[PDB]
PDB file of C-alpha atoms and ligand atoms in Angstrom:
ATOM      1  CA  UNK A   1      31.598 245.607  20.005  1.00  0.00           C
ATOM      2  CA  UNK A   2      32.294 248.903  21.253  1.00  0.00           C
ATOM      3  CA  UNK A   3      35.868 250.250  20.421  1.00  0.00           C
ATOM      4  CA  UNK A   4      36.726 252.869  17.937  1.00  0.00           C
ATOM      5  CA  UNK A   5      33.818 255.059  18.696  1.00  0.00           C
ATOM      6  CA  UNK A   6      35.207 259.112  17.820  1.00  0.00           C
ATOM      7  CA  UNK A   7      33.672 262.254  18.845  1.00  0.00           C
ATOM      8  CA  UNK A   8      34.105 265.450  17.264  1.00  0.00           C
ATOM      9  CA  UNK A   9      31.686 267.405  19.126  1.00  0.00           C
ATOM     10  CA  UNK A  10      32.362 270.000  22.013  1.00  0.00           C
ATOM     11  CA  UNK A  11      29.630 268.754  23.651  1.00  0.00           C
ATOM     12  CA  UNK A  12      28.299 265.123  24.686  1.00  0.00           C
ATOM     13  CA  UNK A  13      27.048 262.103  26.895  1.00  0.00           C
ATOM     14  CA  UNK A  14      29.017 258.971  26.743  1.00  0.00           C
ATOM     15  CA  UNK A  15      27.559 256.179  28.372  1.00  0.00           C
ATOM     16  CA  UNK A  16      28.503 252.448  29.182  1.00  0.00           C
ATOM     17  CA  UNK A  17      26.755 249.913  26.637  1.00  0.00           C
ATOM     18  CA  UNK A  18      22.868 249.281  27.733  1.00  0.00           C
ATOM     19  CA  UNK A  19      23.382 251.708  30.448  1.00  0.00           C
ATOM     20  CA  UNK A  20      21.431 251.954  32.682  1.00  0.00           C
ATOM     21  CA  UNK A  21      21.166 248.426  32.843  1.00  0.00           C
ATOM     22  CA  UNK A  22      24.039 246.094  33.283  1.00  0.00           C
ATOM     23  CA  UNK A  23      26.827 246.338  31.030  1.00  0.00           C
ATOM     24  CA  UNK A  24      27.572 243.039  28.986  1.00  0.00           C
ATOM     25  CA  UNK A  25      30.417 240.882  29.784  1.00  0.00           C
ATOM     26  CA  UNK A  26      34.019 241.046  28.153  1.00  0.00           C
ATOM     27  CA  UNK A  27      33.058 244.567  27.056  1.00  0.00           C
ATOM     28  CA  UNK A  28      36.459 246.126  25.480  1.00  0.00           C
ATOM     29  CA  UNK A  29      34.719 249.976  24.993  1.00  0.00           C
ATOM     30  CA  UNK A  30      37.002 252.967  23.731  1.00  0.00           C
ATOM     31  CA  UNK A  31      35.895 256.675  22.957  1.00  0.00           C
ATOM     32  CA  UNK A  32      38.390 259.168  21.882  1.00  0.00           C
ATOM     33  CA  UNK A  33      36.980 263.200  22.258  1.00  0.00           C
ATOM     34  CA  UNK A  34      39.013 264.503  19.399  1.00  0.00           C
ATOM     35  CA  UNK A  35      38.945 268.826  19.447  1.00  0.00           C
ATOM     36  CA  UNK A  36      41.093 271.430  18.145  1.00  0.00           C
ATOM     37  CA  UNK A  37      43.897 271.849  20.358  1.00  0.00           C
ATOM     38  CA  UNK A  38      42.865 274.712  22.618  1.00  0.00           C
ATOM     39  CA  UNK A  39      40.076 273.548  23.633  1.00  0.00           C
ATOM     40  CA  UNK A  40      39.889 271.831  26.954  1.00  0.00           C
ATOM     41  CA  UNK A  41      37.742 269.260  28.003  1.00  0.00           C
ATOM     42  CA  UNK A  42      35.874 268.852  31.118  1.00  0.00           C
ATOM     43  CA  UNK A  43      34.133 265.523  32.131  1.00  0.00           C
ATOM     44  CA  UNK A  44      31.675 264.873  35.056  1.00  0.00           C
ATOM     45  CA  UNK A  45      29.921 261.515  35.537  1.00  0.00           C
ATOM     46  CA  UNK A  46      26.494 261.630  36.237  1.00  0.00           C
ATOM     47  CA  UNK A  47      23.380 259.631  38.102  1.00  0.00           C
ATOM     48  CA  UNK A  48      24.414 256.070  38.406  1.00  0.00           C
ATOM     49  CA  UNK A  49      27.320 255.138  38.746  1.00  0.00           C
ATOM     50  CA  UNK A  50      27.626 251.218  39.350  1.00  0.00           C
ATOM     51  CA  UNK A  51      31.044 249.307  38.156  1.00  0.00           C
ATOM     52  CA  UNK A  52      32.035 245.874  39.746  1.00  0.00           C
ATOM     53  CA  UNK A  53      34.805 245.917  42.398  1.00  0.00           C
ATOM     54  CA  UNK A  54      36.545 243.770  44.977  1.00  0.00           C
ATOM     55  CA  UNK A  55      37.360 244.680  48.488  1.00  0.00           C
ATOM     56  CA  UNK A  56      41.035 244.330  48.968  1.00  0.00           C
ATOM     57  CA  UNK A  57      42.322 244.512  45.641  1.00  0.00           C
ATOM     58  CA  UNK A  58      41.865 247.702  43.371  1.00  0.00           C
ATOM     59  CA  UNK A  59      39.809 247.395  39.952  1.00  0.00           C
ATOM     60  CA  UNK A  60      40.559 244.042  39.280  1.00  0.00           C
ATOM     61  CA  UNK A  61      37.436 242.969  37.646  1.00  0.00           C
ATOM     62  CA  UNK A  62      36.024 245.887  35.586  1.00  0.00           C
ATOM     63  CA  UNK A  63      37.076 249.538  35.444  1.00  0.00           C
ATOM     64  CA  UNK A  64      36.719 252.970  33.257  1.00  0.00           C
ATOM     65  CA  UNK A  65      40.039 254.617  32.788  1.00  0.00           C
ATOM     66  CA  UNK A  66      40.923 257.820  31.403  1.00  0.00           C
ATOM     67  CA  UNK A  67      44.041 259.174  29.552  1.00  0.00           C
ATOM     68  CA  UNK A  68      44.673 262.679  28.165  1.00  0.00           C
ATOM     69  CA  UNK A  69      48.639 263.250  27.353  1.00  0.00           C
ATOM     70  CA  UNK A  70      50.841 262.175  29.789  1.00  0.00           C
ATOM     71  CA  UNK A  71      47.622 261.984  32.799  1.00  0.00           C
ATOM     72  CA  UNK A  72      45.589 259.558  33.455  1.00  0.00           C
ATOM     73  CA  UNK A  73      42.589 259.308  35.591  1.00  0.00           C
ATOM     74  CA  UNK A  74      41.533 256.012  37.416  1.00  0.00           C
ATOM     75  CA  UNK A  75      40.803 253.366  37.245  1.00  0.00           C
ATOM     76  CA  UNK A  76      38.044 253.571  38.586  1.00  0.00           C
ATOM     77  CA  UNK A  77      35.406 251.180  40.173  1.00  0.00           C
ATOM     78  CA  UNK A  78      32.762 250.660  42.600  1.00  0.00           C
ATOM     79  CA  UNK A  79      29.670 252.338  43.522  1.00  0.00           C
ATOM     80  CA  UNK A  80      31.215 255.824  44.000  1.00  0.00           C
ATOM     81  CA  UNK A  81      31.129 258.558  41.320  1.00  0.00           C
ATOM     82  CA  UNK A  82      34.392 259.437  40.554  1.00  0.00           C
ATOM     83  CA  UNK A  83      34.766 263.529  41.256  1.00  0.00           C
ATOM     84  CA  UNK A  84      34.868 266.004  37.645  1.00  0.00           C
ATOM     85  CA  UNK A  85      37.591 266.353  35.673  1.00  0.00           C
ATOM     86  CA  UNK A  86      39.130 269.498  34.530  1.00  0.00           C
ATOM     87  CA  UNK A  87      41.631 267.047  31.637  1.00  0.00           C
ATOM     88  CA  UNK A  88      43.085 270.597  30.069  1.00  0.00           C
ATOM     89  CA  UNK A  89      43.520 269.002  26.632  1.00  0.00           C
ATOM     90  CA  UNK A  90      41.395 268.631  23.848  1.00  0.00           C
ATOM     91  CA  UNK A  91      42.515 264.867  22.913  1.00  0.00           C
ATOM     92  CA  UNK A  92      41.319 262.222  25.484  1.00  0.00           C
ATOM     93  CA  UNK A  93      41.162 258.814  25.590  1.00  0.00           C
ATOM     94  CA  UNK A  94      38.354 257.072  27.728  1.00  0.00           C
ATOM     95  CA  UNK A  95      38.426 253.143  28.239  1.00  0.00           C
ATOM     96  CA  UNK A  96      36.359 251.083  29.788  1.00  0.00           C
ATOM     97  CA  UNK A  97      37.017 247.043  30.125  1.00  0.00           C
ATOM     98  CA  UNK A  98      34.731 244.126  32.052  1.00  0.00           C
ATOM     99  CA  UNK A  99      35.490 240.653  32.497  1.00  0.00           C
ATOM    100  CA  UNK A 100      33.011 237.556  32.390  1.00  0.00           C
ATOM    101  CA  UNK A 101      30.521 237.598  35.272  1.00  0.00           C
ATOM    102  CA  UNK A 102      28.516 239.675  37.447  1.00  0.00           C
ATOM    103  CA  UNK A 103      25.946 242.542  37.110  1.00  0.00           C
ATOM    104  CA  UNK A 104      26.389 246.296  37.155  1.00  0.00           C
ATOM    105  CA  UNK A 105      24.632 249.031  36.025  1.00  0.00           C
ATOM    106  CA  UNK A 106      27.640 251.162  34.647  1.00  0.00           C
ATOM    107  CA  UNK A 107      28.357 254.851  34.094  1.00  0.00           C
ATOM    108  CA  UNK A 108      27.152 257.483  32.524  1.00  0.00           C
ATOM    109  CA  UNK A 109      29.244 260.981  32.049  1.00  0.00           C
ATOM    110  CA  UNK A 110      29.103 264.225  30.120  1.00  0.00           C
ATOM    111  CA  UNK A 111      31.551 266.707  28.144  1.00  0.00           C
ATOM    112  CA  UNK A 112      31.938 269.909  27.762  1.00  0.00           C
ATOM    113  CA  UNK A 113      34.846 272.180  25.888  1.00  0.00           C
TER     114      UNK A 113
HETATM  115 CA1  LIG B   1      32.192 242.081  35.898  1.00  0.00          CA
END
């Protein structure tokens, strides 16, 4: 269990469950940064980042996604960290699903507003 989690804060690290070590299976994660509107959030992932992928399809196994308004951001997958994001809204929504097998270590990212 890992949905519903609400942050308030201008400031924070968000990580995948057990991060750094793997993530469980079936994970259904959600984390909504909920500011003032004005503010604008920024997100960078940092050290690790380690999400299952395939090699001709995109995402189809496990993947975080990120939605603020009408943008969204990924999914995203694979060993590379995705680059910062500048979301320019203070409401976003960051997901994060896995499906039943393998081993990955996950992600780890900060905010800022
Ligand atoms: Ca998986």
């Amino acid at each position: 269990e890992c949905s519903g989690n609400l942050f308030t804060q201008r400031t924070g690290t968000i990580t995948s469950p057990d991060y750094p070590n793997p993530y469980p299976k079936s994970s259904e994660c959600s984390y909504t940064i909920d500011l003032e509107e004005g503010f604008m959030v920024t997100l960078q992932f940092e050290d690790i980042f380690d999400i299952e992928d395939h090699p001709e399809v995109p995402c189809p196994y496990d993947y975080i996604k990120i939605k603020a308004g009408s943008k969204v951001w990924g999914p995203f997958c694979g060993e590379k960290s995705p680059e910062p994001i500048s979301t320019q809204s203070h409401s976003i929504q960051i997901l994060f699903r896995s499906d039943n097998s393998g081993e990955n270590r996950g992600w780890r990212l900060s905010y800022r507003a």
